[PDB]
Amino acid sequence: IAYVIGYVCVYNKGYQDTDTVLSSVTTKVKGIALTNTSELGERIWDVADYIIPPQEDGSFFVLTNMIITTNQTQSKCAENPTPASTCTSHRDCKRGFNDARGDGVRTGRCVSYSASVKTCEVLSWCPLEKIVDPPNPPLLADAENFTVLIKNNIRYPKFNFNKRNILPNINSSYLTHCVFSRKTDPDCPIFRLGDIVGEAEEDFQIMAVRGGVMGVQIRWDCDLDMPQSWCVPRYTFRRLDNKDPDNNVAPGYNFRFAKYYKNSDGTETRTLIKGYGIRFDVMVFGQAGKFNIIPTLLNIGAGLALLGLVNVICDW
Amino acid sequence: IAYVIGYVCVYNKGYQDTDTVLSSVTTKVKGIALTNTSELGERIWDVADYIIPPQEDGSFFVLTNMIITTNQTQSKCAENPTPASTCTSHRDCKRGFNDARGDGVRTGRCVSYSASVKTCEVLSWCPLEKIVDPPNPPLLADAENFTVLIKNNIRYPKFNFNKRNILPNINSSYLTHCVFSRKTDPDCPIFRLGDIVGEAEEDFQIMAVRGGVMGVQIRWDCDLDMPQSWCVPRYTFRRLDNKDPDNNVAPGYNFRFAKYYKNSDGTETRTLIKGYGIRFDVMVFGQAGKFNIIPTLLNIGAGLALLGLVNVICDW
Amino acid sequence: VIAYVIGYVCVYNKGYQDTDTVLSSVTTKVKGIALTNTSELGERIWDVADYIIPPQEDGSFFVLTNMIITTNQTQSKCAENPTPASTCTSHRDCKRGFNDARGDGVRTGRCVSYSASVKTCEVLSWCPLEKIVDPPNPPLLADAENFTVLIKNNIRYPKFNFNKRNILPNINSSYLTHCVFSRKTDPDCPIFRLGDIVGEAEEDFQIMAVRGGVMGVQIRWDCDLDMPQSWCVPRYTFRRLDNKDPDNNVAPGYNFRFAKYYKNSDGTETRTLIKGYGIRFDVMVFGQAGKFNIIPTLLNIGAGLALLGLVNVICDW
Ligand SMILES: CC(C)c1cc(Br)c(NC(=O)Nc2cccnc2)c(Br)c1
Ligand SMILES: CC(C)c1cc(Br)c(NC(=O)Nc2cccnc2)c(Br)c1
Ligand SMILES: CC(C)c1cc(Br)c(NC(=O)Nc2cccnc2)c(Br)c1
Ligand SMILES: *[C@@H]1O[C@H](CO)[C@@H](O)[C@H](O)[C@H]1NC(C)=O
Ligand SMILES: *[C@@H]1O[C@H](CO)[C@@H](O)[C@H](O)[C@H]1NC(C)=O
Ligand SMILES: *[C@@H]1O[C@H](CO)[C@@H](O)[C@H](O)[C@H]1NC(C)=O
Ligand SMILES: *[C@@H]1O[C@H](CO)[C@@H](O)[C@H](O)[C@H]1NC(C)=O
Ligand SMILES: *[C@@H]1O[C@H](CO)[C@@H](O)[C@H](O)[C@H]1NC(C)=O
Ligand SMILES: *[C@@H]1O[C@H](CO)[C@@H](O)[C@H](O)[C@H]1NC(C)=O
Ligand SMILES: *[C@@H]1O[C@H](CO)[C@@H](O)[C@H](O)[C@H]1NC(C)=O
Ligand SMILES: *[C@@H]1O[C@H](CO)[C@@H](O)[C@H](O)[C@H]1NC(C)=O
Ligand SMILES: *[C@@H]1O[C@H](CO)[C@@H](O)[C@H](O)[C@H]1NC(C)=O
């Protein structure tokens, strides 16, 4: 008798009708980066430069490192050295054979890539992207000091509940100059990228050399029987990409994009950037419960049946 | 006896095995806007101009107002007036100090922004974006008359159910020239942005002056025991961003993007646009139920146990 | 019925399971090269930076297959396309300032001769207009049939504190370097082929790519945590998501328009408008996991005993 109400009715939440969450997320990134490499000279980077695409709210990408190829035009051209594409004679290379290496469609003739070696001749954007390891340290290290503001609006449809992650006790003056600290400022929604990466027990620079995927998990576990002010979100940070170099393929997170230009004579030129960066995904989940009568009665009946069973067992 | 079957078996849906929904959404926007401001002259806007990014199906952004800065180049330059960045002497400004205001990295020297005042000297894209309130009325007011077509395809995996929001009774001739009216055309999926904003008890112009977030909620609550034709979606519209100027930070919804150009001599120029617009999010949710035997028997047993309990109570 | 309860309700109904949903992240990378040799454009190659718009939309990627290109478009006063609803009989026929829903532009009072035979209302917009021309057949990027896509899915069950990846630990990197997905031969390879994905839905790639369409990759994570961890594997299914009946749907296929902007020496702005038809792949991850519990088991046992009492009473009568 005491056991049923003690555990099944209370801790198991059998007296609760439950619902899931419907959420929307808005992210705004602020920060400025500087680069002083010899190849590019002296350059600054603002919010319109290191975020690709410009608006991907809910999952934003921050550029940290890049490889740039300029003055690329559609032309016949030479492949990079490779044992599987080395040219012994004109009959070695096959015309029209599309390769999976990403160079381009092959032609019958082959040309000398350098004095020492010759390779098959293909038509593509040239000059090709050199196979070079990304620079270390990363070009946009100062991305460690960027800030991100996250605004989350949740709704429980069955209970007709709407909530925001910005508590009503918080004034705008404090939000103007604010930062998230686990011990000092738990209600600030303005996180730091370096802090987010550190909370997962990782170093920002090593991750940003080759990129990676990070995930911000917001948990809305709210009991609507309790007062509304007890409904608060819980923030957790977790890496989402494999680090073992033996099991995964294509470590880190990188992708290629391009800029197109037209010259005076009308010819088209392309600048190809392969960017390595850290992609942050906002993952919102939760479940809410409210008191109900029918589930309570069914659980009480099942508990009484279990009491009858245990009484019968003890009788024997 | 009558109570159990009357309420617990029927209204509580205890005889139902339930499943969630798996949905895909496709949105297409049509409309044309005109602008006749003195700064830009006389310009037209089509679907390829006021949607950024071009394809974000499921959550589309419609530009309504903008601030444009042109001929921005990487150079040493002067900051905007600010009490926290006012220059008293060369020793006042600190070289290499990165600011959170978004201007750029500071240098030791400082220069006169105007005759009256002088500020610290920084290197960034210049000329800077002037701190100017967005124009009122909004530049793209005609965005009130745009139309959006929403196609939603849902599936319940456990029951192997597939459904579309376009009913089979609807012919293409009616869909060619169609609009959504709550009282007249409830099955048309072609909504009007002005109507969507009005259904939330708001004015379109005021919202579009500074932007905001809107949310279209589609509810698929379908009982598969009933015939298939009874499975229809329900559309609701709700604002998702705070309007109180005292609690939220960064009111409205705006973001910055850029266009890059290359001159004949090779120098790079940027045109920075800060755009204010209304972001519509499509939020699809639902739950379906079908008859089952085991849950029915368990509920009948629990009801009989409750009947035994109430009989015992009445005996005492 | 004592046997029946344990045989069916306790075991097959999974009444002894506390259940949780899945929280997933998806990463997609596309590799392939296309060639076009049309007379209008000449001889062009296409890489991963050309046929994917936008460049990063991980979880739902769009692959360009066919396109219509209009060049040298500038803001100017100009003439409309022929149309019975926009044909000009006289200057009083066209109304100035009347915005149309056809997508041409705002109308002006005057009207001009589109050709010698016919005249139409005069509007200000980007010109020359996009000609109303059927998309080329066969599609320009047919070689998109041979592209490959790598899908990496990371799932978590929060209540049970479970984290899993779709790349099994038994798989080595050497096999993943040169790998392809075959239902009968290589079920654990996550490197799919677009042609194979379309074929698994009983469709032809070329016909779909002529006008575009929407495809959906469904990954099912139905894992029983009571069983060992190695039994937790995903199941891949492929389904078309857009209607094919030309009588019920509107705007068949999947296409959208985008633009490129250029600035000339004198400062005037020019636009190149591309209407692209392509196949959009959506990754849809769903699942549910269960683990043993005591309270649900006891409640189900009690309900089964109550049902046993009911059936005994019924048999007595
Ligand atoms: C020329 C080179 C040094 C260079 C310049 C810039 Br600016 C950027 N950054 C961007 O283009 N960001 C961006 C924004 C919006 C859409 N697409 C991309 C890069 Br990666 C390389
Ligand atoms: C020069 C100024 C008057 C101007 C011109 C245009 Br055109 C636009 N619109 C866009 O660039 N839209 C858009 C589309 C695709 C990708 N990125 C942006 C803007 Br906001 C300002
Ligand atoms: C000039 C014409 C032949 C042409 C050239 C190209 Br290159 C492309 N392709 C793209 O522009 N892809 C793309 C990538 C990133 C952002 N926006 C678009 C197209 Br459709 C037409
Ligand atoms: C950038 O580097 C150059 C030489 O490498 C140096 O003269 C200059 O002071 C540097 N600027 C900054 C801001 O570090
Ligand atoms: C980030 O800011 C701190 C404090 O100003 C500074 O010490 C650190 O060097 C900055 N990070 C980088 C990469 O410069
Ligand atoms: C704003 O909120 C902070 C948070 O503690 C508080 O210290 C401060 O007094 C508040 N300001 C006003 C004017 O109430
Ligand atoms: C735009 O404004 C100019 C002057 O401000 C005027 O002459 C012209 O008729 C206007 N055009 C439209 C379409 O309103
Ligand atoms: C939208 O259309 C209506 C009817 O044609 C018109 O009265 C209204 O002015 C239009 N909106 C704007 C912003 O011009
Ligand atoms: C098309 O559907 C509309 C909707 O009511 C109907 O009025 C009309 O008769 C239908 N047309 C045909 C040809 O059936
Ligand atoms: C492209 O077409 C031209 C003529 O139409 C032909 O000369 C050339 O060989 C073709 N190239 C390829 C790679 O098919
Ligand atoms: C795809 O590859 C196969 C095998 O190499 C080839 O037969 C086929 O023609 C290719 N597809 C296209 C569209 O060329
Ligand atoms: C890599 O995995 C494949 C998969 O069967 C296997 O055949 C091969 O022997 C493995 N290589 C090594 C070095 O274990």
Residue numbers in the entry:
A (entry chain A), B (entry chain B): 43 to 358
C (entry chain C): 42 to 358
What does the paper say about this structure?
P2X receptors are ATP-activated cation channels, and the P2X4 subtype plays important roles in the immune system and the central nervous system, particularly in neuropathic pain. Here, we report the cryo-EM structures of the zebrafish P2X4 receptor in complex with two P2X4 subtype-specific antagonists, BX430 and BAY-1797. Both antagonists bind to the same allosteric site located at the subunit interface at the top of the extracellular domain. The overall structures of the zebrafish P2X4 receptor in complex with BX430 and BAY-1797 are very similar and show a chalice-like trimeric architecture with each subunit containing a relatively large extracellular domain and two TM helices, resembling the shape of a dolphin, as in the previously reported P2X receptor structures.
BX430, or 1-(2,6-dibromo-4-isopropylphenyl)-3-(3-pyridyl)urea, is a phenylurea antagonist. BX430 inhibited ATP-dependent currents of both zebrafish P2X4 and human P2X4 (hP2X4) with comparable IC50 values at sub-micromolar levels, and the results were consistent with the previously reported IC50 value of 0.54 µM for hP2X4. In the BX430-bound structure, the dibromo-isopropylphenyl group of BX430 faces the outer side of the receptor, while the pyridine group faces the inner side. The binding site consists mainly of hydrophobic residues, including Trp87, Ile94, Met108, Ile110, Phe299, and Ile315 from one subunit and Tyr302 from the neighboring subunit. In addition, the main chain carbonyl group of Asp91 forms hydrogen bonds with the amines in the urea group of BX430. Interestingly, the side chain of Lys301 forms a cation-pi interaction with the aromatic ring of Tyr302 from the neighboring subunit, allowing hydrophobic interactions between the side chain of Lys301 and the 4-isopropylphenyl ring of BX430. Furthermore, there are intersubunit salt bridges between the side chains of Arg85 of one subunit and Glu310 of the neighboring subunit, and hydrogen bonds between the side chain of Tyr302 of one subunit and the main-chain carbonyl group of Ala90 and the side chain of Asp91 of the neighboring subunit. Further close inspection of the allosteric site revealed that in the apo state, the side chain of Lys301 faces the inside of the receptor, which would cause steric hindrance with the pyridine group of BX430 in the BX430-bound structure. It should be noted that the binding pocket is more expanded in the presence of BX430 than in the presence of BAY-1797, probably simply because the 4-isopropylphenyl ring of BX430, located in the outer region of the binding pocket, is bulkier than the phenyl ring of the phenylacetamide moiety of BAY-1797.
